[PDB]
Write an enzyme that holds these catalytic residues in place. Sequence first.
Site, PDB file in Angstrom:
ATOM      1  N   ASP A  25      38.753  20.555  42.818  1.00 30.95           N
ATOM      2  CA  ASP A  25      38.742  21.561  43.880  1.00 30.95           C
ATOM      3  C   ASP A  25      38.361  22.940  43.355  1.00 30.95           C
ATOM      4  O   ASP A  25      39.196  23.704  42.871  1.00 30.95           O
ATOM      5  CB  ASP A  25      40.103  21.585  44.522  1.00 30.95           C
ATOM      6  CG  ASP A  25      40.096  22.398  45.727  1.00 30.95           C
ATOM      7  OD1 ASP A  25      39.075  23.072  46.027  1.00 30.95           O
ATOM      8  OD2 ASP A  25      41.131  22.360  46.472  1.00 30.95           O
ATOM      9  N   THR A  26      37.084  23.312  43.508  1.00 33.51           N
ATOM     10  CA  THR A  26      36.617  24.608  43.073  1.00 33.51           C
ATOM     11  C   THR A  26      37.203  25.758  43.862  1.00 33.51           C
ATOM     12  O   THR A  26      37.143  26.910  43.406  1.00 33.51           O
ATOM     13  CB  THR A  26      35.089  24.675  43.076  1.00 33.51           C
ATOM     14  OG1 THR A  26      34.608  24.474  44.407  1.00 33.51           O
ATOM     15  CG2 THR A  26      34.458  23.645  42.169  1.00 33.51           C
ATOM     16  N   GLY A  27      37.722  25.487  45.064  1.00 37.75           N
ATOM     17  CA  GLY A  27      38.349  26.509  45.878  1.00 37.75           C
ATOM     18  C   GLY A  27      39.792  26.772  45.565  1.00 37.75           C
ATOM     19  O   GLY A  27      40.405  27.636  46.239  1.00 37.75           O
TER      20      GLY A  27
END
Lengths: 99, 99
Positions: A25-27
């Site tokens: 999850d880059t967010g």
Amino acid sequence: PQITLWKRPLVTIKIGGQLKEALLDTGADDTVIEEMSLPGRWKPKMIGGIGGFIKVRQYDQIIIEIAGHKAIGTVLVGPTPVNIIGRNLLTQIGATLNF
Amino acid sequence: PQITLWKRPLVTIKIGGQLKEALLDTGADDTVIEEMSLPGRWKPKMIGGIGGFIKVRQYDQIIIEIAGHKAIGTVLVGPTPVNIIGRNLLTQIGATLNF
Ligand SMILES: CC(C)CN(C[C@@H](O)[C@H](Cc1ccccc1)NC(=O)O[C@H]1CCO[C@H]2OCC[C@H]21)S(=O)(=O)c1ccc(B(O)O)cc1
Ligand SMILES: [Cl-]
Ligand SMILES: [Cl-]
Ligand SMILES: [Cl-]
Ligand SMILES: [Cl-]
Ligand SMILES: [Cl-]
Ligand code: NA
């Protein structure tokens, strides 16, 4: 590996001697795992996103294996609907977003 | 580009002629933007995030530029904490995760 984004980028992790499925999850700034026990000291934290905040336990210096790659860092444990591998650990395995 | 994850993966987007900042978010199925005016009809959608569900407005076939790359697709509008570019549009710009 190169992981396309047609479906959720789920991988197997090993944490606390347990296997779990988690989202790359880059967010997410930090890594957030569903309730489990971990060794060592912790401190409370509140983290927020869509829908508001949850209370978690912050454990520092935890070793994870993420799709076969070992990394150490902070893990937040609490009532997350999905296990999330956040940037704090994605950096350690050399993950990049490419386009 | 090749985007590392030491910092949040923030980019400029353009929607409705206006520039905004948004987060490239592999953990998001859908793209969610803060309150703004978009053309056409909308449909209801409930999305679930870390802290529970929120109602959003679903607008389909919206022109949006992401870090200079043109996309046309679904945008959800509602009380998100930050603008998030999810997989529906990350796939249109050809993004992959790599390690
Ligand atoms: C909204 C984002 C800015 C942040 N989130 C990460 C998202 O990727 C989030 C992950 C997720 C997936 C599934 C359920 C819960 C959380 N994605 C998210 O909220 O997705 C929503 C919106 C977009 O479409 C849907 O896709 C999945 C569920 C829906 S977050 O999960 O809210 C989050 C993670 C870590 C921290 B921290 O370490 O202080 C804070 C917040
Ligand atoms: Cl999926
Ligand atoms: Cl860390
Ligand atoms: Cl690097
Ligand atoms: Cl940009
Ligand atoms: Cl779409
Ligand atoms: Na510790």
